[PDB]
Amino acid sequence: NHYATKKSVAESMLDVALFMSNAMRLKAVLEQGPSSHYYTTLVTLISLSLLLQVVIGVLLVVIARLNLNEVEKQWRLNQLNNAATILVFFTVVINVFITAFG
């Protein structure tokens, strides 16, 4: 099998617990109606939270592939590691606001 090997890697670098938790939260607020409180802020907070997770997932794929294969450049890795670390940090910050406003 070859697809199963890819699925494990692609599922290794994504928080399925947090990603799936936000999935129903977007659904629950959507069925609650635009007139409901914090509808406008919760939609954008969740949307960019999931959006940041996708970009995080893509970045983690690049770093993992580039780590062992490439050994010459290290300055590119340092920038990518910082961007991956910082982007994860903003997901932690957003999740608190979702929890606080939820």
Q: Given the rule CB under 8 A, which residues bind a copy of itself? A: 1-4, 6-7, 9-16, 19-20, 23-24, 26-27, 54, 56-58, 60-65, 69, 75, 78, 81-82, 84-86, 88-89, 91-93, 96-97, 99-101
- Report CA-CA distances (Å) from 46 to 34, 56, 81, 96, 97: 15, 15, 24, 11, 10
CB 64 within 8 A of CB 13: yes
7 binds, among a copy of itself, ligand CLR, none (CB under 5 to 8 A by kind): a copy of itself
Give the annotated binding-site residues for cholesterol. Answer: 79
